[PDB]
Design a protein around this ligand. Structure first.
Ligand SMILES: CCCCCCCCCCCCCCCCCC(=O)OC[C@H](COP(=O)([O-])OCC(O)COP(=O)([O-])OC[C@@H](COC(=O)CCCCCCCCCCCCCCCCC)OC(=O)CCCCCCCCCCCCCCCCC)OC(=O)CCCCCCCCCCCCCCCCC
Ligand SMILES: CCCCCCCCCCCCCCCCCC(=O)OC[C@H](COP(=O)([O-])OCC[N+](C)(C)C)OC(=O)CCCCCCCCCCCCCCCCC
Ligand SMILES: CCCCCCCCCCCCCCCCCC(=O)OC[C@H](COP(=O)([O-])OCC[N+](C)(C)C)OC(=O)CCCCCCCCCCCCCCCCC
Ligand SMILES: CCCCCCCCCCCCCCCCCC(=O)OC[C@H](COP(=O)(O)OCCN)OC(=O)CCCCCCCCCCCCCCCCC
Ligand SMILES: CCCCCCCCCCCCCCCCCC(=O)OC[C@H](COP(=O)(O)OCCN)OC(=O)CCCCCCCCCCCCCCCCC
Ligand SMILES: CCCCCCCCCCCCCCCCCC(=O)OC[C@H](COP(=O)(O)OCCN)OC(=O)CCCCCCCCCCCCCCCCC
Ligand SMILES: CCCCCCCCCCCCCCCCCC(=O)OC[C@H](COP(=O)(O)OCCN)OC(=O)CCCCCCCCCCCCCCCCC
Ligand SMILES: CCCCCCCCCCCCCCCCCC(=O)OC[C@H](COP(=O)(O)OCCN)OC(=O)CCCCCCCCCCCCCCCCC
Ligand SMILES: CCCCCCCCCCCCCCCCCC(=O)OC[C@H](COP(=O)(O)OCCN)OC(=O)CCCCCCCCCCCCCCCCC
Ligand SMILES: CCCCCCCCCCCC(=O)OC[C@H](COP(=O)(O)OCC[N+](C)(C)C)OC(=O)CCCCCCCCCCC
Ligand SMILES: CCCCCCCCCCCC(=O)OC[C@H](COP(=O)(O)OCC[N+](C)(C)C)OC(=O)CCCCCCCCCCC
Ligand SMILES: [Zn+2]
Lengths: 128, 171, 63, 459, 88, 55, 99, 174, 56
């Protein structure tokens, strides 16, 4: 009758078809009410500076600073040379270089061999 | 979150809006608009909450299967053809502080009255901060709803950026 | 922004117009040179192998 | 070259002996006269180069680099006036002295006829550059950036010193004119393999080459505005100038030693261009775009074709004015919002109308919109690399697609959209900033009318 | 955009004009403050249809967060005035 | 993976790390005269037994 | 506190004290003279006159000469029936092959 | 008049005469007259005024000539003075030959446009002269590299002469 | 040809005239939309003269 919805990483599950929404218990209520507390608490701190009439500048957001830091300066100190990184670091770093080498080496060797034999057409080739 | 009442009303508005897209014509929409309303009446006053949530759960799946692939959307609503079209003309009020004095000479009445609003905001700021510190619990706000002005001569807390916002057709 | 564009326009034309007027006059009342065979026994200077007057002046004075 | 060396030196007495409130005016006014007189180097001849004396000579390759080098000193002094406003008087004059010294070592490097003289000056540029990055940077990472910029250059430079001295003992001279007539074919042996690496690794660390480029995202990002301009505009082109000169005495070994470096450069364009699509810092995005552009220069130089050498020279000049322009534009935002994150200030076209026109023009030249000299240089390389191998068109083509993506992603993210509500200190653009950008784009667009003066000796 | 500007009186007239055309509302007792639930014997489902007729009247959607919070024609008039910059 | 991890870990970091380790060994010295001079004796013997510097 | 340090100095707005500021300096007298040197030498001298000088370079790298010379040779070559261009750049009467 | 015809040949023109077969006036005929009076004539008056000024202050410029010097084949190894002049002469001849390939290419491009749809057969002579000059240019200047010089060009010529000389031995083998 | 060549280029140069006048501001605003329309309108008639010569 109604085919089941099968989500994906590029098509999220609709909220109206999400079973977790209908099963409303006390524990979720406190959780959902607790999340609104942090969100409401954060809003007031931002609003007491946004509406300040003597403030002229940029309201520094620690959430934004943590995002940039986690993306640039926090990578290496939290990296370990394990099997997953060593293999990924090899076929993404050295793999393509080796693949392209033989693709150009094979093509240039073939072209060079023809030119020596004189059977490669270069009749009007005077620009290189 | 949304109670069981809200989750049913919202499903009701969506169904008619998507039903309207399929029918197109006004007379044919009214026909199925009434039949759709009837299905929501025969279960209007169900007593068992479990059955009530069962009906809602089994109605959403029917709605998803029958939704129009390309529903009608208002021009200025999210996803519409005119959404955010005029955000490029909405300039904030603080940009006028940096106008050259020569430019302000062309609008003396406007900038003679703009200064009054600035003075009003500056004088009423300190009270607004007090009105929130005393009226807020020990830990912190548990909701985003602000309190009104509880006294005469005091403006509601946090009014500047909700009152002086750019017009929906700035130019 | 308007003020800057006025200054950019003013200073470019401050010396741009004389150059345009000056170049126009040189091409009308002096003109280019005529290609001719070198007279026998005459050694041209290094700035006589160029057509336009300004090119000749550049070679003679600086180069 | 004494008519340019000596006036540059006199900029030091001028700065120190001037009034306290006129150091920026006297330095900027006289640095523009030295630039004006630098056009006399354009007296080039089709057959022979200019050979002033036993020490200094100028040809069609070094001439455009000299003109660009002497044109940045005024621009660097304009860009540094603001962030050094509340600075001690003496330290401002020491800052100007470092820039003047850097120019002096640069106009003697591009004209040094003897290679060892080129090496001493090629290395002398580290000192003032290191001091500028480390003393007048703004972040904590400026100290760690100087060490990378110092030891990457020295790691490959010292092997070059040994190789040059070996050549003089064998050949008998390092004068570049002599090496045009006494050069001999390089016999293929394990000994000559390492002389090729030593003679070329110093210059490929400064381009930079992909893999050895880790020093650039630090130095360019962490330097002051003046440091970034010269770092990306004239100092990345020492590697290009050196290779164009040292490759004379490395034939025919370059025909098979160039493979590992061509693959790194060809595949490095795509890696570095892709990195730009996911950069949170605006100044880091511009730095990674230099690595991608300088990889085409490396490929053009190593394949040794007349078209590639013409293309490489144009690309170096074009990238000098475009990268410098982008650094200035990003700094203009930095001096207002005091941050480098690209997503902090958005929708700046509704607040700074005329500053969004410079962003558009800078981006269009970056993505090689014809007939800008960026496209002329990048086009000549693709034509030559096609004859080298038809398959390189795939890699060059994909890099063009990605280049337009991040060039416009930078434009859309910062200029278009909705402005950040809480940022209310975005004041109108100053005449200094508007003139600073206008002295970048206008020369860059005027050279399209007469491109032959930036096309190098092979023209 | 060349369209006539709205007015508080104009908005009020059109808001009531639609209600006068709703069968379950008797025009005799229809007033600018007639509560839909407590003064006209209407349920929420009918109140949803009222909003669906106001937005199709002025051609702009009212979010369900605010649609289910207006319980009087005067409130609807105020809501449109706020969202269209109507002041006099 | 490449620009921030491996390209750093195959040249700058590993070379830098080795020099730090080599510095601790050379400098971590107890300061005792008895043990410095005992090292001179080992150098003199090795110079004669292994490397034959005395001929 | 961990030490005695000055508070962060709020960024000074150059337009508050001088709405006619060009952005070069705080002193109105110095600021105006800084804009004139940059705009005069930068634009009125280096660019406008530099472009004119470059436009009239004396036959940069003898490209107009080469075209003019090639016209003379082609006229001579076809008039006397000789090949327009030879495939040997050097006269073989002065070359000695290895064996 | 402004260019020698021999180097830049131009076949004689053949303009068909008008043969009207209609009563309606030809708009082009009126525009041709209206253009001559309003555009061509006022332009000529200005040009005559300017050309009169030139004749008052006439002066000449000459075409530089380079006398021949010994080529690279006559220079002792590692003799910079003799190699230098031999090298400069080679570079001047390289430029001249580049312009020759341009002159012949311009002929072939002018012929194709001039001959319209019959270019396939009427430009045979222009094409052949282009196929020969290109072959000559390719032999003496192709594959030298970015660092081309007289020594490498000579090295290329001698290698080819060896192949040509070796072709005779295996050609006159019967 | 004296006319076919001239009128063929004037069509292209005419379209560039409003661009040049809007850089050095040797014009007046509030009429620019009507200025661009006229240039296109006049560029259409000038381009038919070459076209008629082709049809003939
Ligand atoms: C850019 C604007 C700046 C221009 C500077 C002025 C130069 C032009 C003036 C000049 O040199 O003298 C012109 C000319 C020179 O005389 P000449 O003997 O023929 O030539 C002199 C030399 O042989 C040849 O002269 P030349 O070699 O010196 O060439 C002149 C010029 C040549 O360039 C030009 O100035 C004009 C070129 C365009 C000509 C128009 C063609 C446009 C083609 C458009 C194609 C379609 C495009 C569509 C897309 O070249 C330059 O000067 C370049 C250096 C200056 C520019 C520096 C770089 C900045 C460029 C601008 C950046 C923006 O003198 C005249 O004035 C002739 C008369 C012209 C008016 C005709 C009117 C006829 C109708 C009369 C009606 C009334 C009747 C009364 C009875
Ligand atoms: C000055 C005119 C004097 C004269 O008649 O010289 C004729 C000469 C005739 O050609 P000539 O080069 O053979 O002059 C004769 C040689 N001398 C002068 C040494 C005796 O033409 C010129 O070269 C003068 C014009 C060039 C000088 C002006 C160029 C300066 C740049 C100006 C840019 C535009 C701004 C003005
Ligand atoms: C709109 C424009 C329409 C066309 C204008 C008509 C004129 C034209 O196009 O050609 C005129 C000329 C060339 O035209 P031309 O070559 O066809 O002819 C000129 C005149 N005759 C015929 C005598 C040769 O264009 C130029 O020369 C522009 C030169 C650009 C100069 C750039 C350098 C100046 C700044 C100094 C350097 C400082 C910055 C550093 C940059 C780095 C340098 C390496
Ligand atoms: C002239 C004709 C020219 C040609 C025109 C026609 C061109 C188009 C040709 C047809 C295109 C068909 C495309 C089909 C490829 C789809 C790839 C795919 O299946 O990725 C989906 C993948 C699902 O994985 P996940 O979400 O984790 O869980 C399972 C949910 N189903 O989720 C992912 O995205 C993971 C991606 C992993 C990589 C998958 C391979 C790519
Ligand atoms: C490389 C080819 C070999 C591929 C296998 C890698 C080696 C391996 O499988 O073991 C990984 C090794 C041990 O792993 P494990 O025991 O699980 O954890 C211990 C943590 N030290 O983990 C280790 O601890 C050491 C592994 C070091 C491997 C370094 C070599 C690979 C580096 C990736 C290439 C670098 C990118 C080069 C790009 C240059 C051009 C841009
Ligand atoms: C062509 C060339 C291609 C090859 C180029 C390879 C790249 C060049 C080599 C890397 C250059 C050095 C990178 C920067 C070094 C560095 O910054 O290390 C930082 C690290 C942190 O410790 P530290 O700063 O001292 O503690 C205070 C913190 N506030 O400090 C340390 O941990 C101590 C590290 C000190 C040693 C680094 C300096 C020497 C590196 C050059 C090689 C030395 C000679 C090699 C040995 C020869 C054989 C014995
Ligand atoms: C990771 C770190 C990797 C480090 C790689 C270390 C490589 C060491 C190579 C040692 C050099 C070998 C050598 O001695 O050169 C060959 C040759 C010696 O024999 P020779 O007497 O000169 O024969 C001809 C004399 N007429 O001498 C010559 O003919 C001239 C050679 C001079 C070249 C400069 C000095 C040797 C090469 C230096 C290192 C090159 C690699 C640079 C890498 C930068 C990073
Ligand atoms: C992150 C570090 C970045 C810096 C990288 C450092 C530079 C790379 C290291 C230097 C490598 C230089 C090569 C030295 C080895 C000796 C080369 C050699 O002797 O090759 C000779 C051989 C003969 O030539 P032939 O191909 O047969 O044709 C002509 C015949 N007359 O011809 C050949 O064999 C062809 C050339 C040698 C083989 C090239 C293989 C390339 C494979 C891609 C490698 C990409 C780089 C990998 C870096 C990992 C770290
Ligand atoms: C190694 C080795 O065995 O070399 C032996 C060497 C051979 O002698 P020979 O063949 O005659 O050489 C004559 C050259 N004309 O004859 C020799 O004895 C000369 C080589 C001596 C080797 C010295 C070994 C010490 C140097 C390496 C120190 C490593 C760093 C240690 C520092 C402490 C680290 C914490
Ligand atoms: C003969 C043995 C000694 C060697 C020769 C030394 C020559 C210089 C003599 C010093 C005289 C002096 O004090 O000169 C001082 C004068 C300049 O005046 P100021 O007031 O310093 O300007 C400084 C202005 N500020 C305060 C704004 C920076 O600068 C000279 O002309 C020095 C030589 C260049
Ligand atoms: C000179 C000239 O040509 O002087 C004209 C111009 C000034 O022009 P102004 O009349 O002041 O208008 C422009 C000023 N505005 C915009 C305020 C009205 O010179 C300068 O400022 C150039 C710098 C002065 C030093 C010149 C030294 C030359 C050697
Ligand atoms: Zn700042």
């Amino acid at each position: 009758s109604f085919p089941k919805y099968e989500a994906s990483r590029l098509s999220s599950l609709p909220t109206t078809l999400d079973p977790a929404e209908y099963d409303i218990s006390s524990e979720t209520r406190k959780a959902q009410a607790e999340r609104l507390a942090i969100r409401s608490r954060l809003k007031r701190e931002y609003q007491l500076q946004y509406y300040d009439p003597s403030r002229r500048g940029v309201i520094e957001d620690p959430a934004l600073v943590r995002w940039t830091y986690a993306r640039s300066a926090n990578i290496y100190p939290n990296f370990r040379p394990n099997t997953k990184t060593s293999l990924l670091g090899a076929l993404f770093g050295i793999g393509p270089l080796v693949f392209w080498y033989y693709v150009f080496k094979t093509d240039r060797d073939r072209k060079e061999k023809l030119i020596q034999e004189g059977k490669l057409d270069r009749t009007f080739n005077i620009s290189y | 979150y949304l109670t069981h009442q809200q989750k049913v009303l919202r499903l009701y508005k969506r169904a008619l809006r998507h039903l309207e897209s399929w029918c197109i014509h006004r007379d044919k929409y009214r026909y199925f608009a009434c039949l759709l309303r009837a299905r929501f009446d025969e279960h209007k006053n169900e007593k068992d909450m479990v059955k009530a949530t069962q009906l809602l759960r089994e109605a959403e799946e029917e709605f998803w299967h029958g939704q129009h692939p390309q529903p009608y959307i208002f021009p200025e609503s999210p996803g519409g053809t005119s959404y955010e079209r005029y955000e490029c003309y909405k300039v904030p009020e603080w940009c006028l502080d940096d106008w050259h004095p020569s430019e302000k000479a062309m609008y003396p009445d406007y900038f003679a009255k703009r200064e009054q609003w600035k003075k009003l905001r500056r004088e009423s700021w300190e009270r607004e901060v007090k009105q929130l510190q005393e009226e807020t619990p020990v830990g912190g706000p548990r909701t985003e709803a602000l309190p009104p002005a509880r006294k005469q001569g005091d403006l509601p807390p946090l009014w500047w950026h909700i009152v002086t916002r750019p017009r929906e057709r700035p130019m | 922004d308007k003020r800057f564009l006025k200054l950019l326009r003013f200073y470019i034309l401050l010396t741009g117009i004389p150059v345009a007027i000056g170049i126009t006059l040189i091409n009308v009342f002096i003109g280019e040179a005529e290609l001719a065979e070198i007279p026998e026994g005459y050694v041209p200077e290094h700035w006589e192998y160029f057509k336009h007057p300004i090119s000749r002046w550049i070679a003679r004075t600086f180069f | 070259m004494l008519k340019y060396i000596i006036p540059t030196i006199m900029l030091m007495p001028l700065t120190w002996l001037s009034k306290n409130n006129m150091i920026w005016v006297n330095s900027t006014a006289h640095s523009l006269l030295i630039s004006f007189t630098s056009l006399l180097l354009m007296n080039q001849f089709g057959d022979n180069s200019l050979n002033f004396s036993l020490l200094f000579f100028s040809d069609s390759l070094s001439t455009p680099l000299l003109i660009l080098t002497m044109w940045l000193l005024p621009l660097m002094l304009m860009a540094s006036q603001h962030h050094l406003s509340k600075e001690n008087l003496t330290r401002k004059k020491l800052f100007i002295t470092m820039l003047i010294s850097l120019q002096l070592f640069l106009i003697m490097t591009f004209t040094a006829m003897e290679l060892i003289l080129f090496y001493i000056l090629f290395e002398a540029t580290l000192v003032p550059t290191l001091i500028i990055i480390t003393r007048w940077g703004n972040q904590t990472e400026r100290l760690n950036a100087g060490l990378y910029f110092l030891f990457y250059t020295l790691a490959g430079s010292l092997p070059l010193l040994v190789a040059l001295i070996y050549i003089q003992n064998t050949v008998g001279s390092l004068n570049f004119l002599m090496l045009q007539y006494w050069v001999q074919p390089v016999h293929n042996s394990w000994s000559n393999v390492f002389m090729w690496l030593a003679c070329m690794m110093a210059f490929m660390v400064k381009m930079p080459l992909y893999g050895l480029h880790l020093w650039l995202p630090k130095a360019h990002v962490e330097a002051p505005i003046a440091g970034s301009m010269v770092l990306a505009a004239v100092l990345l082109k020492l590697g290009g100038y050196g290779m164009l000169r040292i490759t004379l005495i490395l034939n025919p070994m370059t025909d098979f030693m160039a493979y590992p470096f061509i693959m790194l450069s060809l595949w490095g364009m795509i890696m570095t261009s892709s990195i730009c699509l996911r950069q949170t810092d605006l100044k880091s995005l511009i730095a990674y775009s230099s690595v991608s552009h300088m990889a085409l220069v490396i490929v053009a130089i190593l394949i040794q074709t007349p078209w590639s050498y013409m293309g490489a020279t144009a690309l170096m000049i074009a990238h000098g004015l475009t990268s410098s322009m982008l650094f200035c534009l990003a700094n203009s935002n930095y001096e207002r919002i005091h941050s480098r994150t690209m997503i902090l200030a958005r929708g700046l076209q509704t607040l700074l109308p005329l500053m969004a026109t410079w962003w558009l023009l800078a981006s269009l030249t970056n993505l090689a919109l014809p007939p800008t000299i960026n496209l002329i240089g990048e086009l000549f390389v693709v034509m030559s690399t096609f004859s080298w191998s038809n398959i390189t068109i795939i890699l060059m083509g994909v890099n063009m697609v990605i280049t337009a993506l991040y060039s416009l992603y930078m434009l859309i993210m910062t200029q278009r959209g909705k402005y950040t509500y809480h940022i209310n200190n975005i004041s109108p653009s100053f005449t200094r900033e508007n003139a600073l950008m206008s002295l970048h784009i206008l020369p860059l667009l005027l050279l399209t009318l007469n491109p032959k003066i930036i096309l190098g000796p092979l023209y | 955009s060349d369209a006539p500007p709205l007015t508080l009186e104009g908005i009020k007239d059109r808001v009531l004009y639609v209600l006068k055309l709703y069968d379950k509302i008797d025009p005799e007792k229809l007033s600018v403050n007639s509560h839909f639930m407590k003064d006209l014997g209407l349920d929420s489902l009918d109140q949803v249809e009222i909003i669906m007729a106001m937005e199709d009247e002025f051609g702009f959607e009212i979010p369900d967060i605010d649609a289910e919070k207006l319980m009087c024609p005067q409130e609807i008039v105020d809501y449109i005035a706020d969202k269209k910059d109507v002041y006099e | 993976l490449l620009d921030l991890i491996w390209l750093e870990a195959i040249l700058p970091k590993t070379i830098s790390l080795a020099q730090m380790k080599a510095s601790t060994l050379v400098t971590n010295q107890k300061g005792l005269i008895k043990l410095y001079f005992l090292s001179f004796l080992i150098t003199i013997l090795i110079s004669m037994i292994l490397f034959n510097f005395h001929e | 506190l961990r030490w005695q340090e000055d508070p962060e100095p709020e960024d000074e707005n150059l337009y508050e004290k001088n709405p006619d500021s060009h952005g070069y300096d705080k002193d109105p007298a110095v600021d105006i003279w800084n804009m004139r040197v940059v705009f005069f030498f930068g634009f009125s001298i280096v660019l406008v006159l530099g472009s004119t000088f470059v436009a009239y370079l004396p036959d940069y790298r003898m490209q107009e000469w080469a075209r003019r010379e090639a016209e003379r040779l082609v006229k001579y070559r076809e008039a006397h029936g000789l090949p327009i261009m030879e495939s040997n750049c050097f006269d073989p009467s002065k070359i000695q092959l290895p064996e | 008049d402004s260019w020698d015809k021999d180097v830049y040949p131009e076949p004689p023109r053949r303009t068909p005469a008008p043969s009207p077969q209609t009563s309606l006036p030809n708009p082009i005929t009126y525009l041709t007259k209206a253009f001559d009076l309003l555009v061509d004539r006022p332009v000529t008056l200005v040009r005559e005024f300017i050309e009169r000024q030139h004749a008052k202050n006439k002066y000449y410029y000459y075409h530089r000539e380079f006398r021949r010097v010994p080529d690279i084949t006559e220079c002792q190894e590692k003799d910079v003075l003799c190699m230098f002049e031999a090298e400069m002469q080679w570079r001047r001849d390289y430029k001249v030959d580049q312009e020759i390939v341009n002159i012949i290419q311009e002929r072939l491009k002018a012929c194709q446009q001039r001959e319209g749809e019959s270019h396939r057969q009427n430009c045979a002579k222009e094409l052949e002269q282009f196929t020969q000059v290109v072959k000559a240019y390719q032999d003496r200047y192709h594959d030298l590299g970015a660092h081309y010089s007289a020594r490498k060009c000579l090295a290329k010529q001698k290698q080819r002469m060896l192949a040509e000389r070796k072709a005779a031995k295996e050609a006159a083998a019967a | 040809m004296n006319m076919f060549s001239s009128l063929s280029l004037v069509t292209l140069l005419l379209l560039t005239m409003p661009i040049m006048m809007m850089s050095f501001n040797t014009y007046k605003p509030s009429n620019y939309p009507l200025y661009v329309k006229t240039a296109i309108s006049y560029a259409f008639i000038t381009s038919m003269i070459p076209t008629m010569m082709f049809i003939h």
